Design a protein around this ligand. Structure first.
Ligand code: NAD
Lengths: 247, 256, 246, 252
């Protein structure tokens, strides 16, 4: 596999259908070495889930907590020499933020909660895994979405938070370059308005967890060492089109 | 004046040199009626600074506080039937955010404050101004910078908070669209620290000035601009549209 | 008005409903002196058409012919001692390019012609016009459409041409900045159809006009190489409705 | 090899420093069968360069000639069941278009010559080779350069063309996706101070580009279409120039 022997930390694995899952699957296939984080009272749920990947570790990480992000690596450091990739599939906004007119919805707290879990956490990860990622063609990937680039209905505060992430990828790309660490993002399409997508986008379909999963994998390999600060769209083409109405 | 009779509220006015000043100077020339805000103990400084614009009111609004933002409009509403524009010229990041490698500097608290002040506050003003701005080809404008788009040494988390601002600007464009409110932003180049680089690479071979920025905020608050929303206009001497690397200045020295 | 005494060349006035007529109406109101180009056997229709703007000149110009473009300015230089702006509102693609699957329709010639009239002719105008535009905060503005930025059904070859056109804008901006000539483009949303954008309407020829006017004004001397969408926010939004029929 | 048994066609291999050489190495390592184009008398040259990849075919193609392009696909059609990918690494501008102030240089003939070879030819290839690619998760990749997005000195007409190419990539993507064809582009960095400004502080090398282009013709890349992927040490995502001084010292 094009990821043989590399050590990768995969965040965001919650279910059978998680993008993070497609990622794990692609990576395991390419023979990487894998570790997983869970939030809250899902210790159970995820270790069951990721058993098939022969995990090096399954460790708590609520990116709300600074001490938890520290410990995550202190404990990872008991299992690994260093670290090759960090994959970042983390996002969240309160409900109240996510359903209605955006300026009706938006509240100070929601804005900073959403930004904190969805954008900063990526940098916070880069900070604490850096020391074990130096000079090894190390890679970092985030999961993002076109609501960053373009305003949409009800994506709301989440779209803003995503734009925030994208900016953060670019600054991390520059901060971590000297250390030879690439930083990039995959922009997925939806996995109930995936209908629109399937009708408009040139490839006439929604994408699946394997297509994204493989892109994220490719982006943590030695083939992708010329790329950094980049948003790759894995969205059947949706991004490069501008129809309006369909019937 | 193309802004005649319009009631426009200006934020971020701190000095002679402030972008808001350029804005105001422009807006005043075009017959706008203007209000002003201040943060902290600047009632006097700012009252004396904006006397020349014959303000309708000068009002406390630290954008940190939900109460100050609500009380802003309750007050503004005592003097002004309704409201036409809001100019958002507000940026903050803790200095600890701005000195060196971005990953070295960035903190949860820094990131938080940065976005709170630099981006959220825009939506907050939209939230509390909205009712005063219903049905009058009303306008909001925000101020931004290319660091939103592309990474740079030092600008760091301010670069992110600006990207968050621009995203905020667009969502607001969609959200107040229904209420006839256009929402746009001006990306301004540096104003007299690397001005030099800007002035050497940029097509028009200069730095911009506050008039040049002011004049464009003016326009985007005019009935002439009512087809433009969610937009980022660069008033930056052309810097955005160009891709060079290092130029090569030639410093002469004389030693006696 | 903010265009008082400025001398502006407007291309592509063909109709009572042309964008260039909105531009004209706007610029004239803002106190500019104006000159207009016509094509072939249309001298008279364009003469009747711009009478209301008290034109300084009505001169032939088929942007196909270098000779015609050189001749425009030679003749324009006889009436004016310098030029303040050029308005580039010219677009053409052969009909067979514009209707169907792009890879089905596209031809070498169509590709050639569309780019020639739609994109290059901007550079040609800059090139011949330049010497009368030096050091007076002069301006060039092209009309463009989001079909350049993103692929659309039927717009096809035109979309690529408009793309070529917005690069022509950028390079010109860089090439002519050193003379104070600001070079910019307005991406115009369509005027009519026969819902999507945040303003929930179609922009009209005045809104487009007033922006082109402002982009030839002294107020916009710090703006160049830029695209300004006057399209009611369409560019910044990504909702397509599906339309069910029951 | 992630490209095993895919039939791919490679244009614009003119020497062993060509991007198309990087692509070829990448693709052959990934187990693809490859065919190559050449213009004019360069049959011999190109047959030598690529001999090492056991070309499935080596065939003439001047992208200026409609008829050469037709024959390209007629003949390739005799050798192959169908076709999996086309790699477009072809650019040309007249010399007079590239050495000065854009507006002084640019000409009607130049502008259109530049667009025909550098931009049209892509659609042109798509057109005539479409039929062999129908429904087999087939792919097209173009090579572009960041001067499509921004202006550089003297890249002039080429930057316009490359911009035009990039739109064509977008339209081809929509024209052809109904047949399952991905249509993308790699904006390569130059292979200096792109080595001083880029976050990764280096010039990307043909393998780094080749490997990417290969990936864009792998079955792993089936949800990516109409994209432009920068393989440029991160130069695109940055605004990082600074004024470099030379010191002149005069005594007394
Ligand atoms: N689901 C889709 O169809 C779709 C489409 C486009 C983009 N995305 C992207 O999907 C990514 C998320 O993955 P998903 O689609 O599998 O479901 P999701 O967006 O509902 O899951 C979010 C993940 O964040 C984790 N998480 C939330 N808060 C956390 C915290 N405080 N600390 C640690 N972890 C936390 C959760 O466990 C969950 O696995 C998001 O980053 C989003 O950008 C998803």
């Amino acid at each position: 596999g094009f990821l043989a022997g590399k050590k990768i930390l995969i965040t965001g694995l919650l279910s059978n259908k998680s993008i993070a899952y497609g990622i794990a699957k692609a990576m395991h296939r390419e023979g990487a070495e894998l570790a997983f984080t869970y939030v809250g009272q899902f210790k159970d749920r995820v270790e069951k889930l990721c058993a098939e990947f022969n995990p090096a570790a399954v460790l708590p990480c609520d990116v709300i907590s600074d001490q938890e992000i520290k410990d995550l690596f202190v404990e990872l450091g008991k299992v690994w020499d260093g670290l090759d990739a960090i994959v970042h599939s983390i996002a969240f906004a309160p409900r109240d933020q996510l359903e209605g007119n955006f300026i009706d919805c938006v509240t100070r707290e929601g804005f900073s909660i959403a930004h904190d879990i969805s954008a900063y956490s990526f940098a916070a990860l880069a900070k604490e895994g850096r020391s074990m990622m130096k000079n090894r063609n190390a890679s970092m990937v985030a999961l993002t979405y076109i609501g960053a680039e373009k305003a949409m209905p009800s994506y709301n505060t989440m779209g803003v938070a995503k734009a925030s992430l994208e900016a953060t990828v670019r600054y991390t790309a520059l901060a971590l370059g000297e250390d030879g660490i690439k930083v990039n993002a995959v922009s997925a399409g939806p996995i109930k308005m995936l209908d629109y997508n399937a009708m408009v986008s040139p490839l006439k379909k929604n994408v699946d967890i394997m297509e994204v999963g493989n892109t994220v994998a490719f982006l943590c390999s030695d083939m992708a060492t010329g790329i950094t600060g980049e948003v790759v769209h894995v969205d059947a083409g949706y991004h490069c089109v501008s129809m309006g109405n369909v019937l």
